Amino acid sequence: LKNLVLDIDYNDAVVVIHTSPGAAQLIARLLDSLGKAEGILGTIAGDDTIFTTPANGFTVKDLYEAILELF
Amino acid sequence: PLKNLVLDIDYNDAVVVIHTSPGAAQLIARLLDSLGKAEGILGTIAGDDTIFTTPANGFTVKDLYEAILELF
Amino acid sequence: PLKNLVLDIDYNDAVVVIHTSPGAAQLIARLLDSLGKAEGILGTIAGDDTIFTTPANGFTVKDLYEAILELFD
Amino acid sequence: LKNLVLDIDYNDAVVVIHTSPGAAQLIARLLDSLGKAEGILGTIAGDDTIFTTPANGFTVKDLYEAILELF
Amino acid sequence: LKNLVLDIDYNDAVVVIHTSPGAAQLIARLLDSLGKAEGILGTIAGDDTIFTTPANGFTVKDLYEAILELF
Amino acid sequence: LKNLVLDIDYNDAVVVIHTSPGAAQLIARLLDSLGKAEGILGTIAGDDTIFTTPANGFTVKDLYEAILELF
Ligand SMILES: NC(=[NH2+])NCCC[C@H](N)C(=O)O
Ligand SMILES: NC(=[NH2+])NCCC[C@H](N)C(=O)O
Ligand SMILES: NC(=[NH2+])NCCC[C@H](N)C(=O)O
Ligand SMILES: NC(=[NH2+])NCCC[C@H](N)C(=O)O
Ligand SMILES: NC(=[NH2+])NCCC[C@H](N)C(=O)O
Ligand SMILES: NC(=[NH2+])NCCC[C@H](N)C(=O)O
Ligand SMILES: [Pb+2]
Ligand SMILES: [Pb+2]
Ligand SMILES: [Pb+2]
Ligand SMILES: [Pb+2]
């Protein structure tokens, strides 16, 4: 979904994405299309921020890379 | 927004209803939210995939409707 | 997701209003979203504990109301 | 403090209360205190808008003044 | 309320529960009973994914075995 | 104002804030005024619980103290 993703960053426990207001459930639904397969344990969207976590055998950086590879 | 997100627009005697793709309601409802009472929009409230928008006094539902299609 | 999540059903001239347990609105609304304009539902919107639903053309609010009752049973 | 409420207006079907970003569910939780007692049939809130309708017998004008003589 | 829960899994940061579309808030409300009496620090729900986290002194695997308890 | 924010706590991954029912998005809105270079990485809000996580550089406690110097 084009330029709705305003920013993608991360840290020790989660990969955080910021979107235009109200776009979070939209972009987050995209990640859930791949989800577990790629190594996304889960994703939760608020209004303009998304939190997603990698599985075991995957670290946040591996997540941060595949996500880029998506958008 | 994007129209591949808006799946259907329709109306009755009280509100104009917009259906969208799962998760898109809030995104699309913010567009209508840019139109004020003067345009005939009293309000707009979105759920997960449906939006209920209602006419401001002085505009009938058909009014709000043709206006929304114009907006799109 | 028993209908014990549904606390009350009633209407007026524009919409049919349902009151559910807190946090059960979206879930109960999905059910109604399985009906469609053909059974007379123009649309359905859920908050946290309340749901507003409204009838399509040629359907009065009372018709939507009786369809919901039978939709839940 | 109710500096979060921006406007209450009406029409033949509902009463709209525009709210600051996010304050919609909080302010709306206020309207659920009134119930069918004070003529409320129900209220749904979004992110910054609330729709509310009068119970049987009450008109929207009545419901409007309730929310005014209550807010 | 039974089949509303599709999957429960975890990693080094949170336990994530996947549920039916729209049941996130209801199920996450079930978790909100346990409180910090258990190992829970917080639980946040979206539409179909639930992110919960362990409080100081508990591991994420603790919170996990305990949530299966609850369910 | 008054009892809107019921608690702020933390663990290994995020700072958890509990609020009054439906107050989460509002409280979260304040948290989003601060970000990245100011400590915060992202803030998600459910209905009464909030999860906030530190920008990759800060300790969850750095972020925590900053949030305290508000509530
Ligand atoms: N219908 C939807 N909005 N789906 C998107 C879900 C995104 C994410 N799993 C969440 O629950 O927050
Ligand atoms: N208009 C609002 N709800 N603003 C608050 C957003 C809070 C947080 N960024 C979230 O996405 O959950
Ligand atoms: N994934 C869901 N929550 N689905 C139910 C949607 C309920 C209703 N149509 C709404 O948009 O508010
Ligand atoms: N936890 C809450 N936000 N409660 C307030 C409910 C507001 C309104 N009845 C709705 O269903 O949208
Ligand atoms: N940032 C947003 N999600 N804005 C959309 C709000 C849409 C509509 N006024 C509502 O309150 O439900
Ligand atoms: N009335 C409710 N929706 N209760 C459930 C809240 C679930 C979760 N603690 C959240 O705040 O996201
Ligand atoms: Pb960045
Ligand atoms: Pb991992
Ligand atoms: Pb009709
Ligand atoms: Pb029948």
Short mmCIF file of C-alpha atoms and ligand atoms in Angstrom, two decimals:
data_model
loop_
_atom_site.label_atom_id
_atom_site.label_comp_id
_atom_site.label_asym_id
_atom_site.label_seq_id
_atom_site.Cartn_x
_atom_site.Cartn_y
_atom_site.Cartn_z
CA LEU A 1 0.00 0.00 0.00
CA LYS A 2 1.99 2.90 -1.50
CA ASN A 3 3.14 5.86 0.66
CA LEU A 4 1.03 5.11 3.76
CA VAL A 5 4.09 3.76 5.54
CA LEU A 6 5.67 6.79 7.10
CA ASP A 7 8.48 5.01 8.93
CA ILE A 8 9.92 1.58 9.76
CA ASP A 9 12.27 1.17 12.73
CA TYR A 10 12.86 -1.35 15.48
CA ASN A 11 14.59 -2.34 18.66
CA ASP A 12 15.20 -5.16 21.13
CA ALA A 13 11.68 -6.67 21.04
CA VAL A 14 9.61 -5.29 18.12
CA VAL A 15 9.59 -3.75 14.60
CA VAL A 16 7.63 -0.51 14.68
CA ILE A 17 5.98 1.04 11.66
CA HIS A 18 4.22 4.41 11.61
CA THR A 19 1.50 5.12 9.06
CA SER A 20 -0.79 7.98 8.05
CA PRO A 21 -3.60 8.28 10.60
CA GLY A 22 -6.07 5.45 10.23
CA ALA A 23 -3.89 3.46 7.90
CA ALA A 24 -2.51 1.05 10.53
CA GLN A 25 -5.12 -1.72 10.24
CA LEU A 26 -4.62 -1.56 6.45
CA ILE A 27 -0.83 -1.93 6.33
CA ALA A 28 -0.91 -4.42 9.23
CA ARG A 29 -3.38 -6.60 7.26
CA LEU A 30 -0.69 -6.76 4.58
CA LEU A 31 1.93 -8.19 6.99
CA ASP A 32 -0.63 -10.73 8.18
CA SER A 33 -0.89 -12.01 4.60
CA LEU A 34 2.60 -13.43 4.99
CA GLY A 35 2.70 -13.49 8.80
CA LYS A 36 3.95 -16.78 10.29
CA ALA A 37 5.36 -18.08 7.01
CA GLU A 38 8.11 -15.44 6.64
CA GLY A 39 8.67 -15.47 10.37
CA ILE A 40 6.20 -12.90 11.64
CA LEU A 41 4.87 -14.21 14.94
CA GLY A 42 2.18 -11.55 15.17
CA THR A 43 1.11 -7.98 14.34
CA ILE A 44 -1.10 -5.48 16.17
CA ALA A 45 -2.23 -2.18 14.68
CA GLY A 46 -3.46 0.87 16.49
CA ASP A 47 -4.43 4.00 14.59
CA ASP A 48 -1.12 5.13 13.07
CA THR A 49 1.38 2.70 14.59
CA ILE A 50 2.07 -1.04 14.07
CA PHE A 51 4.02 -3.50 16.25
CA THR A 52 5.11 -6.83 14.84
CA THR A 53 7.38 -9.56 16.30
CA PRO A 54 9.55 -12.29 14.78
CA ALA A 55 9.29 -15.97 15.71
CA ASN A 56 11.91 -18.30 17.17
CA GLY A 57 14.60 -18.89 14.60
CA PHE A 58 14.08 -15.23 13.60
CA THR A 59 15.27 -11.98 15.19
CA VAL A 60 13.77 -8.45 14.73
CA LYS A 61 16.38 -7.56 12.10
CA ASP A 62 15.36 -10.54 9.96
CA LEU A 63 11.86 -9.11 10.32
CA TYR A 64 13.00 -5.59 9.49
CA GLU A 65 14.56 -6.97 6.31
CA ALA A 66 11.66 -9.04 5.02
CA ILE A 67 9.31 -6.10 5.71
CA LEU A 68 11.50 -3.87 3.55
CA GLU A 69 11.38 -6.67 0.99
CA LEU A 70 7.58 -6.26 1.13
CA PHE A 71 7.30 -2.48 0.81
CA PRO B 1 -6.85 6.18 0.03
CA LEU B 2 -7.62 4.28 -3.20
CA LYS B 3 -10.87 3.14 -4.82
CA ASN B 4 -9.78 -0.47 -4.95
CA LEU B 5 -10.31 -0.08 -1.16
CA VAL B 6 -13.92 1.19 -1.48
CA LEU B 7 -16.09 -1.76 -2.34
CA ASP B 8 -19.59 -0.22 -2.38
CA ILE B 9 -21.51 2.99 -1.73
CA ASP B 10 -25.25 3.01 -1.06
CA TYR B 11 -27.88 4.69 1.06
CA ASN B 12 -31.29 4.64 2.76
CA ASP B 13 -33.49 7.32 4.35
CA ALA B 14 -31.18 7.97 7.33
CA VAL B 15 -27.53 7.38 6.33
CA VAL B 16 -25.16 6.74 3.37
CA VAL B 17 -23.18 3.47 3.78
CA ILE B 18 -19.66 2.78 2.47
CA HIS B 19 -18.13 -0.66 2.58
CA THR B 20 -14.37 -1.10 2.24
CA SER B 21 -11.66 -3.78 2.37
CA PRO B 22 -10.96 -5.13 5.90
CA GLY B 23 -9.16 -2.46 7.84
CA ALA B 24 -9.73 0.39 5.36
CA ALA B 25 -12.75 2.13 6.96
CA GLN B 26 -10.78 4.61 9.08
CA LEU B 27 -8.56 5.46 6.14
CA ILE B 28 -11.45 6.30 3.75
CA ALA B 29 -13.64 7.97 6.38
CA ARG B 30 -10.93 10.61 6.94
CA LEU B 31 -11.57 11.77 3.35
CA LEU B 32 -15.25 12.45 3.99
CA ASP B 33 -14.10 14.06 7.28
CA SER B 34 -12.40 16.75 5.24
CA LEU B 35 -15.84 17.82 3.95
CA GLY B 36 -17.77 19.95 6.39
CA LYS B 37 -21.37 20.59 7.39
CA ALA B 38 -21.64 23.19 4.62
CA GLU B 39 -21.09 20.42 2.06
CA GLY B 40 -23.91 18.62 3.71
CA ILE B 41 -21.84 16.24 5.84
CA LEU B 42 -22.98 16.26 9.47
CA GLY B 43 -20.68 13.45 10.45
CA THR B 44 -18.91 10.25 9.54
CA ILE B 45 -18.10 7.28 11.72
CA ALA B 46 -16.03 4.32 10.65
CA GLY B 47 -15.76 0.76 11.94
CA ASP B 48 -13.49 -1.88 10.50
CA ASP B 49 -14.95 -2.12 7.04
CA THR B 50 -18.09 -0.01 7.01
CA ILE B 51 -18.77 3.71 7.30
CA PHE B 52 -22.03 5.43 8.23
CA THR B 53 -22.15 9.05 7.07
CA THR B 54 -25.16 11.25 7.74
CA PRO B 55 -26.64 14.48 6.22
CA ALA B 56 -26.37 17.86 7.87
CA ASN B 57 -29.73 19.60 8.28
CA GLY B 58 -30.64 21.24 4.99
CA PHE B 59 -29.43 18.30 2.93
CA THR B 60 -31.27 15.06 2.36
CA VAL B 61 -29.60 11.68 2.18
CA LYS B 62 -29.64 11.72 -1.65
CA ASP B 63 -27.77 15.03 -1.31
CA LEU B 64 -25.08 13.63 0.94
CA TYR B 65 -24.88 10.69 -1.49
CA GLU B 66 -24.34 12.51 -4.80
CA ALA B 67 -21.84 14.66 -2.90
CA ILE B 68 -19.85 11.62 -1.70
CA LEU B 69 -19.64 10.16 -5.24
CA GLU B 70 -18.45 13.57 -6.39
CA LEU B 71 -15.87 13.52 -3.59
CA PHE B 72 -14.71 10.13 -4.90
CA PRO C 1 -19.37 -16.64 21.36
CA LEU C 2 -22.84 -17.34 22.77
CA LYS C 3 -25.54 -14.75 22.44
CA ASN C 4 -24.97 -14.01 26.13
CA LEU C 5 -22.65 -11.46 24.55
CA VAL C 6 -25.87 -9.82 23.29
CA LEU C 7 -27.31 -7.76 26.12
CA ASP C 8 -30.17 -5.99 24.31
CA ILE C 9 -31.84 -5.38 20.95
CA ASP C 10 -34.23 -2.60 20.01
CA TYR C 11 -34.61 0.17 17.43
CA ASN C 12 -36.14 3.45 16.38
CA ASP C 13 -36.73 5.09 12.97
CA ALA C 14 -33.20 5.09 11.53
CA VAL C 15 -31.35 2.12 13.13
CA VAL C 16 -31.47 -1.15 15.09
CA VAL C 17 -29.24 -0.93 18.17
CA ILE C 18 -27.62 -3.90 19.90
CA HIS C 19 -25.77 -3.75 23.22
CA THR C 20 -23.13 -6.39 23.71
CA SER C 21 -20.64 -7.30 26.44
CA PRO C 22 -17.66 -4.97 26.43
CA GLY C 23 -15.37 -5.79 23.54
CA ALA C 24 -17.88 -8.07 21.87
CA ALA C 25 -19.22 -5.55 19.30
CA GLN C 26 -16.91 -6.32 16.38
CA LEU C 27 -17.41 -10.08 16.79
CA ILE C 28 -21.22 -9.92 16.95
CA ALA C 29 -21.27 -7.43 14.03
CA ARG C 30 -19.40 -9.88 11.79
CA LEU C 31 -22.39 -12.19 12.06
CA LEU C 32 -24.77 -9.51 10.77
CA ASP C 33 -22.19 -8.77 8.05
CA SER C 34 -22.89 -12.30 6.81
CA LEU C 35 -26.51 -11.29 5.99
CA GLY C 36 -26.18 -8.51 3.36
CA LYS C 37 -28.67 -6.21 1.57
CA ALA C 38 -30.68 -9.25 0.40
CA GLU C 39 -31.95 -9.93 3.94
CA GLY C 40 -32.23 -6.16 4.15
CA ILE C 41 -29.05 -4.93 5.84
CA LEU C 42 -27.57 -1.82 4.28
CA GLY C 43 -24.72 -1.76 6.75
CA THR C 44 -23.45 -2.49 10.23
CA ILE C 45 -21.02 -0.55 12.44
CA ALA C 46 -19.61 -1.70 15.78
CA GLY C 47 -17.91 0.15 18.57
CA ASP C 48 -16.86 -1.62 21.75
CA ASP C 49 -20.25 -2.52 23.25
CA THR C 50 -22.73 -1.04 20.79
CA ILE C 51 -23.66 -1.85 17.22
CA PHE C 52 -25.83 0.29 14.89
CA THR C 53 -27.31 -1.50 11.87
CA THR C 54 -29.58 -0.01 9.24
CA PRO C 55 -31.98 -1.32 6.56
CA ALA C 56 -31.67 -1.33 2.78
CA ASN C 57 -34.40 0.13 0.57
CA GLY C 58 -37.82 -1.57 0.62
CA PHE C 59 -37.03 -2.66 4.17
CA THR C 60 -38.25 -0.75 7.18
CA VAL C 61 -36.30 -0.71 10.44
CA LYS C 62 -38.84 -3.14 11.98
CA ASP C 63 -38.13 -5.65 9.20
CA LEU C 64 -34.37 -5.45 9.87
CA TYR C 65 -35.20 -5.92 13.54
CA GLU C 66 -37.18 -9.15 13.05
CA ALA C 67 -34.48 -10.50 10.71
CA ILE C 68 -31.79 -9.88 13.36
CA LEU C 69 -33.83 -11.68 16.03
CA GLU C 70 -34.08 -14.71 13.74
CA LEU C 71 -30.48 -14.25 12.66
CA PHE C 72 -29.38 -14.74 16.25
CA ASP C 73 -31.66 -17.67 17.05
CA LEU D 1 -11.83 18.02 31.13
CA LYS D 2 -14.39 18.45 28.34
CA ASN D 3 -12.10 20.57 26.15
CA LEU D 4 -12.10 17.37 24.09
CA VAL D 5 -15.63 18.03 22.80
CA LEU D 6 -15.63 20.22 19.68
CA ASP D 7 -19.30 20.16 18.66
CA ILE D 8 -22.74 18.57 19.15
CA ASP D 9 -25.22 18.99 16.31
CA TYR D 10 -28.16 17.03 14.97
CA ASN D 11 -30.52 15.95 12.22
CA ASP D 12 -33.49 13.61 11.85
CA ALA D 13 -31.61 10.44 12.73
CA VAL D 14 -28.69 10.98 15.13
CA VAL D 15 -26.80 13.45 17.27
CA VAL D 16 -23.16 13.91 16.28
CA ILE D 17 -20.46 14.92 18.74
CA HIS D 18 -17.15 15.71 17.13
CA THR D 19 -14.29 15.01 19.48
CA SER D 20 -10.53 15.62 19.54
CA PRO D 21 -8.42 12.80 18.10
CA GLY D 22 -8.97 9.75 20.39
CA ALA D 23 -11.32 11.25 22.97
CA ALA D 24 -14.29 9.67 21.19
CA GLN D 25 -14.52 6.45 23.22
CA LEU D 26 -13.96 8.31 26.56
CA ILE D 27 -16.59 10.98 25.89
CA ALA D 28 -18.84 8.22 24.50
CA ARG D 29 -18.42 6.23 27.69
CA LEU D 30 -20.03 9.27 29.33
CA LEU D 31 -23.18 8.91 27.16
CA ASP D 32 -23.55 5.27 28.22
CA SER D 33 -24.23 6.51 31.76
CA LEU D 34 -27.58 8.02 30.65
CA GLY D 35 -29.16 5.00 28.99
CA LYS D 36 -32.85 4.51 28.18
CA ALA D 37 -33.59 6.34 31.39
CA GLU D 38 -32.73 9.69 29.83
CA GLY D 39 -33.90 8.68 26.36
CA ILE D 40 -30.83 7.09 24.84
CA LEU D 41 -31.15 4.14 22.50
CA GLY D 42 -27.44 3.76 21.98
CA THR D 43 -24.17 5.34 21.00
CA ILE D 44 -21.20 4.21 18.83
CA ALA D 45 -17.93 6.07 18.78
CA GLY D 46 -15.18 6.15 16.24
CA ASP D 47 -11.89 8.00 16.63
CA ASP D 48 -13.23 11.53 16.87
CA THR D 49 -16.95 11.25 16.09
CA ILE D 50 -19.88 9.78 18.03
CA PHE D 51 -23.37 8.99 16.73
CA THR D 52 -26.19 8.73 19.23
CA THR D 53 -29.93 8.15 18.76
CA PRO D 54 -32.97 8.67 21.06
CA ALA D 55 -34.97 5.75 22.53
CA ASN D 56 -38.61 5.25 21.46
CA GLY D 57 -40.79 8.27 22.11
CA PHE D 58 -38.00 10.80 22.54
CA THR D 59 -37.13 12.95 19.53
CA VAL D 60 -33.57 13.75 18.49
CA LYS D 61 -34.10 17.32 19.74
CA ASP D 62 -34.83 15.93 23.18
CA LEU D 63 -31.79 13.65 23.08
CA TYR D 64 -29.75 16.65 21.93
CA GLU D 65 -30.76 18.72 24.92
CA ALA D 66 -30.10 15.75 27.20
CA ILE D 67 -26.50 15.60 26.03
CA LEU D 68 -26.40 19.38 26.45
CA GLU D 69 -28.04 19.20 29.89
CA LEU D 70 -25.55 16.49 30.89
CA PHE D 71 -22.31 17.36 29.14
CA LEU E 1 -15.53 -18.40 24.11
CA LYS E 2 -14.17 -21.65 22.67
CA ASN E 3 -13.16 -21.67 18.99
CA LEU E 4 -12.63 -17.93 19.05
CA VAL E 5 -8.97 -18.69 19.77
CA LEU E 6 -6.99 -19.92 16.79
CA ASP E 7 -3.40 -19.99 18.03
CA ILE E 8 -1.23 -19.09 21.02
CA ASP E 9 2.54 -18.75 20.59
CA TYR E 10 5.46 -16.73 21.93
CA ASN E 11 9.06 -15.57 21.62
CA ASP E 12 11.54 -13.63 23.83
CA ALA E 13 9.28 -10.56 24.22
CA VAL E 14 5.53 -11.40 24.16
CA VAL E 15 3.01 -14.20 23.91
CA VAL E 16 0.72 -13.62 20.94
CA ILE E 17 -2.76 -15.00 20.55
CA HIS E 18 -4.49 -15.18 17.17
CA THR E 19 -8.25 -15.25 17.23
CA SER E 20 -11.23 -15.04 14.93
CA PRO E 21 -11.75 -11.70 13.10
CA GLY E 22 -12.95 -9.23 15.67
CA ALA E 23 -12.68 -11.34 18.79
CA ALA E 24 -9.38 -9.80 19.92
CA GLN E 25 -10.95 -7.38 22.36
CA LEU E 26 -13.22 -10.02 23.96
CA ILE E 27 -10.51 -12.65 24.49
CA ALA E 28 -7.95 -10.01 25.65
CA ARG E 29 -10.59 -9.07 28.22
CA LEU E 30 -10.46 -12.64 29.56
CA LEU E 31 -6.71 -12.23 30.07
CA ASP E 32 -7.34 -8.91 31.88
CA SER E 33 -8.66 -10.89 34.89
CA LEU E 34 -5.39 -12.61 35.82
CA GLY E 35 -3.64 -9.28 36.52
CA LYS E 36 -0.15 -8.95 38.04
CA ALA E 37 -1.23 -11.59 40.56
CA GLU E 38 -0.14 -13.84 37.67
CA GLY E 39 2.87 -12.87 35.56
CA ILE E 40 1.06 -10.38 33.32
CA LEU E 41 2.23 -6.80 32.96
CA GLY E 42 -0.05 -5.96 30.05
CA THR E 43 -2.24 -7.16 27.23
CA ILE E 44 -3.13 -5.17 24.14
CA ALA E 45 -5.64 -6.29 21.50
CA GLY E 46 -6.23 -5.28 17.92
CA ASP E 47 -8.74 -7.03 15.69
CA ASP E 48 -7.44 -10.59 15.50
CA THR E 49 -4.05 -10.60 17.25
CA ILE E 50 -3.33 -10.21 20.98
CA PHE E 51 0.03 -9.08 22.40
CA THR E 52 0.52 -9.79 26.13
CA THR E 53 3.69 -9.41 28.19
CA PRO E 54 5.26 -10.80 31.42
CA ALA E 55 6.01 -8.62 34.46
CA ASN E 56 9.42 -8.28 36.10
CA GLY E 57 10.30 -11.60 37.67
CA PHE E 58 8.59 -13.79 35.11
CA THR E 59 9.90 -15.08 31.82
CA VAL E 60 7.85 -14.97 28.61
CA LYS E 61 7.63 -18.76 28.75
CA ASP E 62 6.09 -18.49 32.21
CA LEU E 63 3.31 -16.19 31.04
CA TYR E 64 2.80 -18.63 28.16
CA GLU E 65 2.33 -21.87 30.20
CA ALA E 66 0.02 -19.87 32.48
CA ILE E 67 -2.14 -18.53 29.60
CA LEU E 68 -2.67 -22.09 28.37
CA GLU E 69 -3.71 -22.77 31.95
CA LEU E 70 -6.34 -20.02 31.72
CA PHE E 71 -7.54 -21.44 28.36
CA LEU F 1 -7.15 15.09 34.33
CA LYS F 2 -7.83 12.98 37.46
CA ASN F 3 -7.80 9.18 37.30
CA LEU F 4 -7.29 8.58 33.55
CA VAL F 5 -3.85 6.89 33.74
CA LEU F 6 -4.02 4.07 36.31
CA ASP F 7 -0.38 2.85 36.15
CA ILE F 8 2.93 2.83 34.30
CA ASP F 9 5.23 -0.17 34.61
CA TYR F 10 7.86 -1.94 32.52
CA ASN F 11 9.77 -5.09 31.89
CA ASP F 12 12.41 -6.30 29.41
CA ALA F 13 10.61 -5.10 26.26
CA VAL F 14 8.02 -2.31 26.77
CA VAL F 15 6.54 0.29 29.12
CA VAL F 16 2.92 -0.65 29.92
CA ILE F 17 0.35 1.97 30.81
CA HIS F 18 -3.13 1.15 32.10
CA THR F 19 -5.88 3.77 31.76
CA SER F 20 -9.63 4.16 32.31
CA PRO F 21 -11.85 2.21 29.89
CA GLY F 22 -11.68 3.85 26.46
CA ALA F 23 -9.05 6.36 27.61
CA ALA F 24 -6.06 4.55 25.98
CA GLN F 25 -6.04 6.32 22.57
CA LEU F 26 -6.21 9.72 24.20
CA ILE F 27 -3.33 9.02 26.66
CA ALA F 28 -1.46 7.45 23.76
CA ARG F 29 -1.94 10.65 21.76
CA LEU F 30 0.13 12.53 24.36
CA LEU F 31 2.89 9.91 24.22
CA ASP F 32 3.12 10.30 20.43
CA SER F 33 4.20 13.95 20.83
CA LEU F 34 7.58 12.50 21.86
CA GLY F 35 9.46 10.03 19.62
CA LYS F 36 12.71 8.47 18.32
CA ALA F 37 15.30 11.15 19.18
CA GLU F 38 13.26 11.89 22.33
CA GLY F 39 13.31 8.28 23.53
CA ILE F 40 10.08 6.70 22.28
CA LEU F 41 10.11 4.21 19.37
CA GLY F 42 6.38 3.53 19.00
CA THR F 43 3.18 3.58 21.06
CA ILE F 44 0.15 1.31 20.46
CA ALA F 45 -3.16 1.69 22.30
CA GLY F 46 -5.95 -0.81 22.77
CA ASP F 47 -8.95 0.20 24.87
CA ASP F 48 -7.48 0.71 28.36
CA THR F 49 -3.95 -0.67 28.05
CA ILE F 50 -1.00 0.90 26.22
CA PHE F 51 2.32 -0.58 25.19
CA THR F 52 5.22 1.76 24.49
CA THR F 53 8.72 0.71 23.52
CA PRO F 54 12.14 2.55 23.63
CA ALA F 55 14.02 3.83 20.61
CA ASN F 56 16.97 1.56 19.85
CA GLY F 57 19.55 3.28 22.04
CA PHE F 58 17.59 3.93 25.21
CA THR F 59 16.87 1.54 28.05
CA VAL F 60 13.26 0.65 28.75
CA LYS F 61 13.89 2.52 32.02
CA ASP F 62 15.15 5.66 30.31
CA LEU F 63 11.83 5.76 28.43
CA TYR F 64 9.96 4.87 31.62
CA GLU F 65 11.35 7.74 33.72
CA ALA F 66 10.59 10.19 30.89
CA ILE F 67 6.96 9.00 30.84
CA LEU F 68 6.79 9.43 34.60
CA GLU F 69 7.86 13.07 34.19
CA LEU F 70 4.37 13.72 32.82
CA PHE F 71 1.96 11.56 34.86
N1 LIG G 1 -9.68 -6.40 9.67
C1 LIG G 1 -8.51 -5.93 10.08
N2 LIG G 1 -8.41 -4.67 10.48
N3 LIG G 1 -7.43 -6.71 10.01
C2 LIG G 1 -6.07 -6.27 10.34
C3 LIG G 1 -5.52 -6.91 11.58
C4 LIG G 1 -4.15 -6.34 11.90
C5 LIG G 1 -3.54 -6.87 13.19
N4 LIG G 1 -3.56 -8.36 13.20
C6 LIG G 1 -4.36 -6.45 14.37
O1 LIG G 1 -5.16 -7.28 14.85
O2 LIG G 1 -4.18 -5.34 14.85
N1 LIG G 2 -6.16 9.53 16.98
C1 LIG G 2 -5.56 8.65 17.77
N2 LIG G 2 -6.20 7.55 18.13
N3 LIG G 2 -4.33 8.86 18.19
C2 LIG G 2 -3.60 7.95 19.06
C3 LIG G 2 -2.77 6.94 18.31
C4 LIG G 2 -2.12 6.06 19.35
C5 LIG G 2 -1.11 5.04 18.84
N4 LIG G 2 -0.13 5.68 17.91
C6 LIG G 2 -1.82 3.93 18.11
O1 LIG G 2 -1.64 3.85 16.88
O2 LIG G 2 -2.52 3.15 18.75
N1 LIG G 3 -12.86 -7.82 11.47
C1 LIG G 3 -14.00 -7.33 11.95
N2 LIG G 3 -13.98 -6.65 13.09
N3 LIG G 3 -15.14 -7.48 11.28
C2 LIG G 3 -16.44 -6.95 11.70
C3 LIG G 3 -16.76 -5.59 11.12
C4 LIG G 3 -18.02 -5.02 11.77
C5 LIG G 3 -18.62 -3.77 11.12
N4 LIG G 3 -18.89 -3.97 9.68
C6 LIG G 3 -17.69 -2.60 11.21
O1 LIG G 3 -17.03 -2.27 10.20
O2 LIG G 3 -17.66 -1.95 12.26
N1 LIG G 4 -14.47 0.79 26.49
C1 LIG G 4 -15.15 1.76 25.90
N2 LIG G 4 -14.56 2.48 24.96
N3 LIG G 4 -16.42 2.01 26.24
C2 LIG G 4 -17.25 3.05 25.63
C3 LIG G 4 -18.20 2.50 24.57
C4 LIG G 4 -18.56 3.59 23.58
C5 LIG G 4 -19.67 3.25 22.58
N4 LIG G 4 -20.82 2.64 23.26
C6 LIG G 4 -19.20 2.26 21.53
O1 LIG G 4 -19.63 1.07 21.59
O2 LIG G 4 -18.45 2.68 20.63
N1 LIG G 5 -7.25 9.12 12.32
C1 LIG G 5 -8.41 8.58 11.99
N2 LIG G 5 -8.61 7.29 12.10
N3 LIG G 5 -9.36 9.33 11.45
C2 LIG G 5 -10.62 8.80 10.96
C3 LIG G 5 -11.83 9.14 11.79
C4 LIG G 5 -13.07 8.71 11.02
C5 LIG G 5 -14.41 8.95 11.70
N4 LIG G 5 -14.60 10.39 11.97
C6 LIG G 5 -14.42 8.27 13.05
O1 LIG G 5 -14.20 8.98 14.04
O2 LIG G 5 -14.67 7.07 13.11
N1 LIG G 6 -13.79 -3.22 26.84
C1 LIG G 6 -12.77 -3.87 26.28
N2 LIG G 6 -12.57 -3.78 24.97
N3 LIG G 6 -11.97 -4.62 27.03
C2 LIG G 6 -10.83 -5.37 26.51
C3 LIG G 6 -9.54 -4.58 26.53
C4 LIG G 6 -8.42 -5.50 26.06
C5 LIG G 6 -6.98 -4.98 26.19
N4 LIG G 6 -6.59 -4.87 27.62
C6 LIG G 6 -6.83 -3.62 25.51
O1 LIG G 6 -6.91 -2.61 26.22
O2 LIG G 6 -6.57 -3.57 24.30
PB PB G 7 13.94 5.27 10.40
PB PB G 8 12.70 -14.36 17.94
PB PB G 9 -35.21 1.53 4.40
PB PB G 10 -36.56 -15.94 7.40
#
